[PDB]
Amino acid sequence: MIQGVIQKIAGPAVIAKGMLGARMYDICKVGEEGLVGEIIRLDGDTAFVQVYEDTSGLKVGEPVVSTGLPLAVELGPGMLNGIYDGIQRPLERIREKTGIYITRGVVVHALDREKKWAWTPMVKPGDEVRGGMVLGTVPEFGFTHKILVPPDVRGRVKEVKPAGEYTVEEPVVVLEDGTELKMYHTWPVRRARPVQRKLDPNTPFLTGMRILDVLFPVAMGGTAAIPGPFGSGKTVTQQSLAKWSNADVVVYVGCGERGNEMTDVLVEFPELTDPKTGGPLMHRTVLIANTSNMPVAAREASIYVGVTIAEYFRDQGFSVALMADSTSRWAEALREISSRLEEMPAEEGYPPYLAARLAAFYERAGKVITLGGEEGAVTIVGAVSPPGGDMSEPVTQSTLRIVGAFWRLDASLAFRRHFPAINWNGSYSLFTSALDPWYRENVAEDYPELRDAISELLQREAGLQEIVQLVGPDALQDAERLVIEVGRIIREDFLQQNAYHEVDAYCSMKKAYGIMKMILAFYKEAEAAIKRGVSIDEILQLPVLERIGRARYVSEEEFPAYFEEAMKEIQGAFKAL
């Protein structure tokens, strides 16, 4: 057995002594109320215990008995609909059995066994089973939440219970291998669910904004990231995957989401109804986020227990949208480790483990077909911040800018009316040569052509921008204000979108397609306006610029007929004048 007591309790961490048989990165039970530690170092019979819950009364000579599980995540149903911790404890059970205050040493079931779930078997008792094979279909709302065989386990069946409710603990398929397949099954958080092969991303993910796709495209099965210095719109950009994503499985998880930000965002989901589902938004949101009211060391666990949950979903055969809300918070939590263990991290205030545990998080799942023949795609978006306000640091380069998309925010940029805001130049996408197939065939064979063509104009204005701030234009010409005004309209209506309004943005092909064709029209004719002898001053004073300036309020349903009537007005109020 593993036994021992507290030697030196210092900070949220406990340093034990007398530890015999203790193994690295394994769950424990710590104190006398159960706070749960992790062996994060050995030095013989002393092992630095890291205790995810903060200490507050615990003292010398108290128990330290390690369980002997490899911080296993308990996989099963009941994930959908219901808040959970980053350390996986349902918050429902806490609020009802304590009070409204979070107290240290609250220990409840990680995966509830105060629930039962209707079983439909499918597998027959005469067959054999295979790792990654469906045993039946548990009906959780409108979704199909299959039950699979844990990888690295197979046998031959001999019995299969008939339909009825059963507790997740009870078996529902038994085998000749000495085992019983239950809907309660261990899989480590340090070991990935096995994949059949890796697939090349080649379908893009629709993140339903006309600037987070159209200009800088993001991939399905991809990875992407957005930063945000000092609260510039770090939290707000997940109101753009709130429901304007095409995922069938949405996992909102936060490394640390402060108290005020779960007063609006976390309560937002039971107050909404997703239109793709047709049913509620919380049906399709897992919820496994962590608060900053929740201890500092719970912030460090967060990432590895929700990534595996993302894999569990990916396996079933559903699009998974995982997005780690402010991944920057796991870094401070990781960095606190050094202080407490007598070590000093990576220089210039950088975390002690850089690439190692960042590259790992991102590549754990992502564009992979499974053992079981289903299509796994994981779209992961890091919503980091630079702690010191520099976008030039190791951890941004290794895995936050070498991904599918890199984006940026300025501080007076977003304040005008762009919510969220992006830098037109300084922001690129690496993946864009692999997102060209679907966009060609499905949308149009000039959707990849027009989207590079809009980006050209947007970044060419930059040419003149500089000289404006050097000594200015003291000469306005016909070819001058051409690029300049156009580009203006483009930044005014196409990058000022709001995520608080469903009329200023929404997930829809045709809105993106449409708006971008209106602008094409205004542009097209303007070049042939000047030649004839039409002053750019009058170009402003056509009402049609205002028609394109009232496409960002238009009702979604109305847009088709609206667009068709408006394309004609451009071409009429240009060629006439």
Partner: protein, 52 residues
């Protein structure tokens, strides 16, 4: 522009990097000094197995 450039602008846009630089650099004295004392602890600990 010429006049202006050779005074306020140009060496000013210089002194900005310089000021920045030096303070980034000097910060890393505390790094090394702390890291020093860290080292001292580590060795001091393996020196209680073999002595006092």
């Amino acid at each position: 522009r010429v006049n202006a450039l050779e005074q306020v602008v140009i060496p000013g846009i210089r002194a900005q990097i310089r000021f920045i630089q030096q303070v980034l650099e000097q910060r890393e004295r505390e790094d090394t000094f702390r890291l020093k004392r860290i080292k001292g602890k580590i060795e001091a600990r393996e020196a209680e197995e073999e002595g006092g």
